[PDB]
Amino acid sequence: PLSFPDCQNGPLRSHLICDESATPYDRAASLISLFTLDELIANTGNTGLGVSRLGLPAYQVWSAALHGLDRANFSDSGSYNWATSFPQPILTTAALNRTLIHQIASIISTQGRAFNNAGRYGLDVYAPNINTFRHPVWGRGQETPGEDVSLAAVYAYEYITGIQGPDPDSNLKLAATAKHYAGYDIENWHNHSRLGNDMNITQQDLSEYYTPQFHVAARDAKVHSVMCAYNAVNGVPACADSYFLQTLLRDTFGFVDHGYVSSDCDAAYNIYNPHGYASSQAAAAAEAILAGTDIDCGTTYQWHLNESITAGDLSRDDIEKGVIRLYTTLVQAGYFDPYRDLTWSDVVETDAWNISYQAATQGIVLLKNSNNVLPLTEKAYPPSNTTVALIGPWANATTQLLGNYYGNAPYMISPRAAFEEAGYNVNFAEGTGISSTSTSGFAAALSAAQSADVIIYAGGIDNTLEAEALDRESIAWPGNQLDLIQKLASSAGNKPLIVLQMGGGQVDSSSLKNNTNVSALLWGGYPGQSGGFALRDIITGRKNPAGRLVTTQYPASYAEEFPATDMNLRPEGDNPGQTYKWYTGEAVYEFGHGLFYTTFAESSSNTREIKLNIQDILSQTHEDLASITQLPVLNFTANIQNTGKVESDYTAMVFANTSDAGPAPYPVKWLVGWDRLGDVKVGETRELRVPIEVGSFARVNEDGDWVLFPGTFELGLNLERKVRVKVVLSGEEEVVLKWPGK
Ligand SMILES: *[C@@H]1O[C@H](CO)[C@@H](O[C@@H]2O[C@H](CO)[C@@H](O[C@@H]3O[C@H](CO[C@H]4O[C@H](CO)[C@@H](O)[C@H](O)[C@@H]4O)[C@@H](O)[C@H](O[C@H]4O[C@H](CO)[C@@H](O)[C@H](O)[C@@H]4O[C@H]4O[C@H](CO)[C@@H](O)[C@H](O)[C@@H]4O)[C@@H]3O)[C@H](O)[C@H]2NC(C)=O)[C@H](O)[C@H]1NC(C)=O
Ligand SMILES: *[C@@H]1O[C@H](CO)[C@@H](O[C@@H]2O[C@H](CO)[C@@H](O)[C@H](O)[C@H]2NC(C)=O)[C@H](O)[C@H]1NC(C)=O
Numbered sequence: 001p002l003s004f005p006d007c008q009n010g011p012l013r014s015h016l017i018c019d020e021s022a023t024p025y026d027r028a029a030s031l032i033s034l035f036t037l038d039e040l041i042a043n044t045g046n047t048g049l050g051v052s053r054l055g056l057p058a059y060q061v062w063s064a065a066l067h068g069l070d071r072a073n074f075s076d077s078g079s080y081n082w083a084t085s086f087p088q089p090i091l092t093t094a095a096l097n098r099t100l101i102h103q104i105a106s107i108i109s110t111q112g113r114a115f116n117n118a119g120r121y122g123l124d125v126y127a128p129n130i131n132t133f134r135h136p137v138w139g140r141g142q143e144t145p146g147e148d149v150s151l152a153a154v155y156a157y158e159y160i161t162g163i164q165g166p167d168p169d170s171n172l173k174l175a176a177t178a179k180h181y182a183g184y185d186i187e188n189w190h191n192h193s194r195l196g197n198d199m200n201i202t203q204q205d206l207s208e209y210y211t212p213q214f215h216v217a218a219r220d221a222k223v224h225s226v227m228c229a230y231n232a233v234n235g236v237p238a239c240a241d242s243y244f245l246q247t248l249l250r251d252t253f254g255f256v257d258h259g260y261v262s263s264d265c266d267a268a269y270n271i272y273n274p275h276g277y278a279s280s281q282a283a284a285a286a287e288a289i290l291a292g293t294d295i296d297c298g299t300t301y302q303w304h305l306n307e308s309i310t311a312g313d314l315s316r317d318d319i320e321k322g323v324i325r326l327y328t329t330l331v332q333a334g335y336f337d338p339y340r341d342l343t344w345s346d347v348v349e350t351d352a353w354n355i356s357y358q359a360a361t362q363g364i365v366l367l368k369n370s371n372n373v374l375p376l377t378e379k380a381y382p383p384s385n386t387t388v389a390l391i392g393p394w395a396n397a398t399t400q401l402l403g404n405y406y407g408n409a410p411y412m413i414s415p416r417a418a419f420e421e422a423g424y425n426v427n428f429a430e431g432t433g434i435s436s437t438s439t440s441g442f443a444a445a446l447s448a449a450q451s452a453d454v455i456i457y458a459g460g461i462d463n464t465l466e467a468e469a470l471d472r473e474s475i476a477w478p479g480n481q482l483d484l485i486q487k488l489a490s491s492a493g494n495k496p497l498i499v500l501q502m503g504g505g506q507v508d509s510s511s512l513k514n515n516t517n518v519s520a521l522l523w524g525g526y527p528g529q530s531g532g533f534a535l536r537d538i539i540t541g542r543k544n545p546a547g548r549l550v551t552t553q554y555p556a557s558y559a560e561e562f563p564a565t566d567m568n569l570r571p572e573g574d575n576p577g578q579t580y581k582w583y584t585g586e587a588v589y590e591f592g593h594g595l596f597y598t599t600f601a602e603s604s605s606n607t608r609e610i611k612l613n614i615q616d617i618l619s620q621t622h623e624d625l626a627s628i629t630q631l632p633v634l635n636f637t638a639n640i641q642n643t644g645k646v647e648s649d650y651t652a653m654v655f656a657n658t659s660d661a662g663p664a665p666y667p668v669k670w671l672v673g674w675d676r677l678g679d680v681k682v683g684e685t686r687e688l689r690v691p692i693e694v695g696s697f698a699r700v701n702e703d704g705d706w707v708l709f710p711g712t713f714e715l716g717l718n719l720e721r722k723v724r725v726k727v728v729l730s731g732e733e734e735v736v737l738k739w740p741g742k
């Protein structure tokens, strides 16, 4: 029942809500001033009932857009029957291509507007997830930009801008919602449910790792909405945490005027049960509202704010504040007044660009290529003369391609189907399942391998192990897949054995790493609707891999070394440090790892130290930048040459480390920039230019303050660290973010 109010011939035509010359806030305020208390409360939840006597339509706040129109009112046939399903964010982020994220978000927003013009979708979306994949067992890590907060911040900016449009204040395409704020990275590990979890986070970790990306989403991307998490932090449920919502988000992080906060579905209720922070549903609703949660996902507000009023927990003005914020966003989206002409044909066109396929091809990571077995070129292995064995619980994957939540897709291309369409003769055998103990399927799998010229095993994990409400307990390969893989390796007989490790989280593949008969190892995440074509084309060399890992592949014992609910990044107790930045152990495959189908030579651009003064750089002008921390202080440059026989895109991560600047402990390293050079021809020498903002050089004190310290920094290209630059910062320490108090 989604429609638009009639501001020309409807009951509101005479009121300021329908005066396109007024300010958006004043329009929404007058509209709310036309309500009764019952009508007002009826619109405090995600399923807002509207006001019938005023011609005000019902509005649904909950729309899913994480990686496409993941849930909409689809038709059974014809128009509005499907929508593009892109890879899960974890795979897209591994392509290290900011413009890719922006374009995906813009396409999603176009199709969303098209469905909303047809009444089948909302005007605000509960995306993007910009939490980090801190601990490898998290069942929603597939929905995140990885474990590094800088990548999460850039993803937030590109996605939120693509979703909202170029003019978010005046002609908003769709309102985005940064989630989940904050400290939400665990579902149920060892019965530590997100609904009741009370996570202990130091102010230092809060400032340095858990909040920064939400600061970017607010100040730089001007996100219109933020969603507060189910969990509590240092004893306070996120949606009842006046410190998170007012002090930080609204007062420090630059949340747009009249931006609205939504609770998770239903975090407001969890304030009462199971957190126990409130003694009743009415008290929970009042506390959430007073802390700043404007709109409830659920029915706690709509069914219990009368009790809140009756108990003197708040006033009607308190309730009006949140509804006014929500409808201010709606007014800025043209609700009561360009994007309104988008229609089904625009969905068809944008899907037909196949940006989903491109995202998969760009994001897939090559972890192992022994003796250049890959690519299996169409010349060396012609389709008409080649049989490929497609084995594994991912070989026939269609819905598995789309990840935890997805809507109607135009099509789902399994690896098997893709190799068949290409004209290969394919022997398919499941072999085993994701988490099975049976061997009944091994014989058929081995038989398919015996008759084949190449063996492709597609397996790993999927949503039967990692999902919302479902955390992993082990990070080893599950089931008996490794056993079957080893049997395949033993019987291969110099036939290429390509292993496809799928899923959002990583699995300990050290076994495959040291196994000589295992020719190649690729990570495919959740590659979206065209995953089969992307995987096939990477294997054949029709596309060349350049993705890198945005998550660390830990040894299995990592998941037993310390409690996953430990929020401390820096090593302490049995925690060896978490994330590439602080991890003191030996990873199986490191964050930032990735191979290419060609060799690239990395040379210094000027065959050299960079000395800079804190006060000089921090007193400069910063036109077009909201903060001086965004100012480029140098360009990290190197020469990249294609010394191989195939043209390939090239990706680079720039890492920084220090041993003197600021307080100990000192990080192993941290990501300061990244780039992707497209289509580097054979022999070409392209130059790498990565700006390094002064923020990258700041470090966080225990009070949570961001400070630029004097000392020596080292900047290194990728994991090989061949090209290097020394940066000496002189002067006095200066605070660039003054962490507020409670
Ligand atoms: C980082 O990531 C970005 C992606 O955001 C990437 O830039 C993109 O590169 C791709 C590859 O060239 C571009 O894809 C093509 O886009 C056109 C339309 O683009 C127009 O509109 C956009 C959005 O407004 C503009 O930005 C852009 O400049 C153009 O004006 C599509 O029409 C293309 O589709 C055809 O090719 C696909 C394969 O590439 C096919 O799958 C598809 O079916 C289409 O086939 C065509 O030919 C067929 C016959 O061969 C025919 O049957 C079909 O009917 C059809 O005519 C294609 O999707 C994309 O636009 C770029 N986006 C931007 C924003 O620039 C960067 O390259 C990347 N950086 C790296 C990797 O280093
Ligand atoms: C590029 O986009 C087109 C858009 O249709 C894809 O072509 C469709 O693929 C499905 C699955 O194979 C077919 O059932 C449709 O009939 C195809 N339509 C047309 C018009 O050809 C194509 O697969 C995409 N290329 C990729 C994903 O690599």
Ligand SMILES: *[C@@H]1O[C@H](CO)[C@@H](O)[C@H](O)[C@H]1NC(C)=O
Pocket (backbone or CB within 6 Å): 001, 002, 073, 118, 119, 120
């Ligand atoms: C889906 O949208 C159509 C067209 O707007 C409408 O007729 C139908 O009732 C909707 N179904 C829902 C919202 O369940």
Ligand SMILES: *[C@@H]1O[C@H](CO)[C@@H](O)[C@H](O)[C@H]1NC(C)=O
Pocket (backbone or CB within 6 Å): 302, 303, 304, 306, 307
């Ligand atoms: C409060 O409102 C809810 C939802 O409309 C209703 O179910 C409940 O009976 C109301 N309580 C009182 C005391 O009116």
Ligand SMILES: *[C@@H]1O[C@H](CO)[C@@H](O)[C@H](O)[C@H]1NC(C)=O
Pocket (backbone or CB within 6 Å): 396, 398, 430
């Ligand atoms: C492979 O996938 C297709 C499409 O979902 C399905 O019809 C078929 O039963 C699957 N085969 C096996 C062996 O699971």
Ligand SMILES: *[C@@H]1O[C@H](CO)[C@@H](O)[C@H](O)[C@H]1NC(C)=O
Pocket (backbone or CB within 6 Å): 632, 633, 634, 635, 689, 691
């Ligand atoms: C980085 O390179 C651009 C383009 O060459 C240049 O304009 C900019 O000043 C450089 N950044 C520096 C010098 O900090």
